[PDB]
Amino acid sequence: SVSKANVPKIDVSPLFGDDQAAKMRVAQQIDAASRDTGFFYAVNHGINVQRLSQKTKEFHMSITPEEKWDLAIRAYNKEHQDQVRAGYYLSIPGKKAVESFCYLNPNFTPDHPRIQAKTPTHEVNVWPDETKHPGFQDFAEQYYWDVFGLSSALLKGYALALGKEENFFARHFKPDDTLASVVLIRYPYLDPYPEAAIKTAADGTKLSFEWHEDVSLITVLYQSNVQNLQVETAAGYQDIEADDTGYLINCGSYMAHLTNNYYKAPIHRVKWVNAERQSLPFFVNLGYDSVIDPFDPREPNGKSDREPLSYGDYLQNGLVSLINKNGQT
Ligand SMILES: C=C[C@@H](NC(=O)[C@H](CS)NC(=O)CCC[C@H](N)C(=O)O)C(=O)O
Numbered sequence: 001s002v003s004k005a006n007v008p009k010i011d012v013s014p015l016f017g018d019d020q021a022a023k024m025r026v027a028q029q030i031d032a033a034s035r036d037t038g039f040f041y042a043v044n045h046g047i048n049v050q051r052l053s054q055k056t057k058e059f060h061m062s063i064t065p066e067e068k069w070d071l072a073i074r075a076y077n078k079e080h081q082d083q084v085r086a087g088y089y090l091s092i093p094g095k096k097a098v099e100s101f102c103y104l105n106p107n108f109t110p111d112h113p114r115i116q117a118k119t120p121t122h123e124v125n126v127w128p129d130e131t132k133h134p135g136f137q138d139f140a141e142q143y144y145w146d147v148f149g150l151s152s153a154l155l156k157g158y159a160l161a162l163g164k165e166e167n168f169f170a171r172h173f174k175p176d177d178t179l180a181s182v183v184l185i186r187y188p189y190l191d192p193y194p195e196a197a198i199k200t201a202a203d204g205t206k207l208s209f210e211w212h213e214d215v216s217l218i219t220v221l222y223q224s225n226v227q228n229l230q231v232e233t234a235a236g237y238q239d240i241e242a243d244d245t246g247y248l249i250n251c252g253s254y255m256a257h258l259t260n261n262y263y264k265a266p267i268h269r270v271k272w273v274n275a276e277r278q279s280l281p282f283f284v285n286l287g288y289d290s291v292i293d294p295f296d297p298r299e300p301n302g303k304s305d306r307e308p309l310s311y312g313d314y315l316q317n318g319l320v321s322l323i324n325k326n327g328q329t
């Protein structure tokens with residue numbers, strides 16, 4: 001039988017305020033978690049996650065096959081050549097159970113300079129029809145900003161944890177340019193459950209999604225209360241307990257690049273569970289030209305061999321790489 005992973009619950013509320021010592025104590029907990037399994041739960045985050053789950057459920061349960069084609073990314077709909085990242089990722093009954101809706105920075109409009117330059121990784125969100133999904137766009141855009149706010153607080157924790165000034169990451173994470181994404185994932189109950197949608201691990205464990213590191217600086221995740229995630233540690237894969245009041249946080253491979261692997265991007269996977277459930281990640285990405293200098297907090301002089309890498313280059317190589325390893329989602 002499988003061990004439970006150490007995933008501490010960290011009260012992050014001090015990261016929103018001005019008590020500096022209290023913030024350092026939070027930063028210490030982030031450091032410890034980041035250097036152990038690489039996961040923690042942010043609690044006292046201030047987000048209304050009951051409404052987030054409720055409104056997401058309404059959307060997933062009421063969207064029709066026709067609307068899905070109309071919002072489809074280009075992998076499902078060749079008419080939609082500008083939609084690499086944003087839109088609907090369809091299920092395929094009998095083959096692929098998971099389906100999702102991805103959106104980016106709401107400030108990415110036709111008049112934003114990056115959209116006018118056609119810079120890669122930037123797109124204008126697509127939305128379903130307002131009368132069919134009343135309030136959904138407004139809710140989802142407001143959600144993007146609420147989780148942006150949590151994520152900025154978190155990034156102040158990570159900076160402090162690494163011995164830097166608090167805005168070290170947060171100042172490259174800006175409303176005007178962030179490449180961050182929200183994905184509203186539906187994992188359905190199905191019987192019979194399509195076997196092609198289940199993968200078997202080297203240890204026999206049935207999976208919905210195989211082992212990987214995240215393409216992110218950090219990932220800020222809300223999930224329903226159904227246990228599914230596993231993290232690889234030196235002792236094997238361990239179960240991450242559910243907590244549908246908190247956000248599950250981990251570093252992605254950009255953080256590992258910046259810190260010369262002092263904060264690793266923890267390898268994790270998703271168990272197959274036959275139950276209706278939701279997974280709503282926010283992938284904290286910086287702007288296309290952010291190029292933080294890699295450093296190394298193990299070393300007295302803090303210096304690293306690694307070459308700077310622009311977030312945009314990282315993200316474009318990274319998103320195409322995760323689709324070829326683990327399949328189209
Ligand atoms: C967060 C956990 C979740 N996994 C996933 O969604 C997997 C790996 S984290 N991720 C993806 O497909 C990356 C797409 C990122 C998004 N379209 C974007 O353009 O930025 C799961 O529950 O399967």
Ligand SMILES: [Fe+2]
Pocket residue numbers: 212213214268
């Ligand atoms: Fe992941």
